[PDB]
């Protein structure tokens, strides 16, 4: 038994095939009350919960190097999304969970990583993606990958409408294998939660 139940606000998620949590670059957030926001920033705890996003269908024809990316923050229709339209500046980290459920008779391996300041990588650079916070998903071992990263960037606070510091990537490392007893394909989903959400600079109403 490798059971892990994660809780973010009034939302929880539990796996029975956990391989642990990978923390990237740091175990904690740096100072959220710096000189750039004077003392006007505030934390908004109601935005710290899980939202969902479909990533891609892991099929037998997708070869090594096949890669899907999700730039964060992404479109959000909950309180976090409202925060982006209501405040000039924000900062937060991410608690990311990615599930690829098929069955134990499937083979192959997916590399799930969190990359700061994304750039389209060469196929040669794809061999070094493990330099970034990551974890793997191989049907023989697990169905869930879990990574937790802090806020970062040249600026202590950001304007997400103009810049996206983090981007989740899932790359095929070894192609999916199927048999008569295996799942024919595996859909890959993300369960994401923003952490330590802080906002500054109240914006006017649209009226």
């Amino acid at each position: 038994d490798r059971l892990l139940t994660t809780r973010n606000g009034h939302t929880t998620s539990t796996t029975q095939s956990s391989v642990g949590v990978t923390y990237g670059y740091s175990t904690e957030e740096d100072h959220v009350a710096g000189p750039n926001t004077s003392g006007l920033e505030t934390r908004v705890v109601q935005a710290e919960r899980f939202f969902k996003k479909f990533l891609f269908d892991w099929t037998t024809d997708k070869p090594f190097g096949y890669l899907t990316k999700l730039e964060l923050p992404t479109d959000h229709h909950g309180v976090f999304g409202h925060l982006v339209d209501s405040y000039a500046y924000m900062r937060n980290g991410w608690d990311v969970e990615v599930s690829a459920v098929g069955n134990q008779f499937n083979g192959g391996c997916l590399l799930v990583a969190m990359v700061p300041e994304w750039k389209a990588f060469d196929t040669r650079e794809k061999y070094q993606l493990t330099l970034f916070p990551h974890q793997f998903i191989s049907p023989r071992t697990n169905m869930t990958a879990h990574i937790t990263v802090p806020y970062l960037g040249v600026n202590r606070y950001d304007q997400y409408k103009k810049h996206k510091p983090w981007t989740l990537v899932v790359m095929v490392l070894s192609p999916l294998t199927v048999s008569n007893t295996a799942a024919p394909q595996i859909k890959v989903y993300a369960n994401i939660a923003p952490t330590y959400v802080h906002v500054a600079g109240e914006l006017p109403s649209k009226e």
Partner: protein, 191 residues
């Protein structure tokens, strides 16, 4: 919480799992002795009537609850509206004894007669269902009763379970639902 459900071990989660606060409960109304302690009517009657709690209606609060138990025990109270005098006789008595006045006999007093009677069966406990291959020397042993009453005419009979004890619960059913979502009915409201 995840658990091994096949074991059938009870599991009771709380809202604390996701950040809530479990509150205070007051469960007086679901207390067995309290809930069974109210008068219930027996519809079928006759000049000679053998007191049997199973003659209680299956959907009434008392009858539903009683049937949701396998074994039970209790003392009893009865309200009887009758013509002439009322004679009661304990469990095991010859039907003929009902005509004799030296058995507890209540002389007519308007509007009815209320009485306290003791449990009187030869068993340590009674049952609402009895799996007998026969049980002789959907039928219950004849010994399962609280005695019998007789009057010139018996117009109404109410019965009340005192000091009730219930054992081994059985299925209790709500009204069958036809609607696509909920069973809706007219709830009282001011005019």
């Amino acid at each position: 919480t995840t658990t091994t459900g096949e074991s059938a071990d009870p599991v009771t989660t709380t809202v604390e799992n996701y950040g809530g606060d479990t509150q205070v409960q007051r469960r007086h109304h679901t207390d067995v002795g309290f809930i069974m302690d109210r008068f219930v009517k027996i519809n079928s009657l006759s000049p000679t009537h053998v007191i049997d709690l199973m003659q209680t209606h299956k959907h009434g609060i008392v009858g539903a609850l009683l049937r949701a138990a396998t074994y039970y025990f209790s003392d009893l109270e009865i309200v009887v509206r009758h013509d002439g005098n009322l004679t009661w006789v304990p469990n095991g008595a010859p039907e003929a004894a009902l005509s004799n006045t030296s058995n507890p006999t209540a002389y007519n007093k308007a509007p009815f007669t209320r009485l306290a009677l003791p449990y009187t069966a030869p068993h340590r406990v009674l049952a609402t269902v009895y799996d007998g291959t026969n049980k002789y020397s959907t039928q219950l042993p004849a010994s399962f009763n609280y005695g019998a009453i007789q009057a010139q005419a018996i117009h109404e009979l109410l019965v009340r379970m005192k000091r009730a004890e219930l054992y081994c619960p059985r299925p209790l059913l709500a009204i069958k639902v036809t609607s696509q979502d909920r069973y809706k009915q007219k709830i009282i409201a001011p005019a």
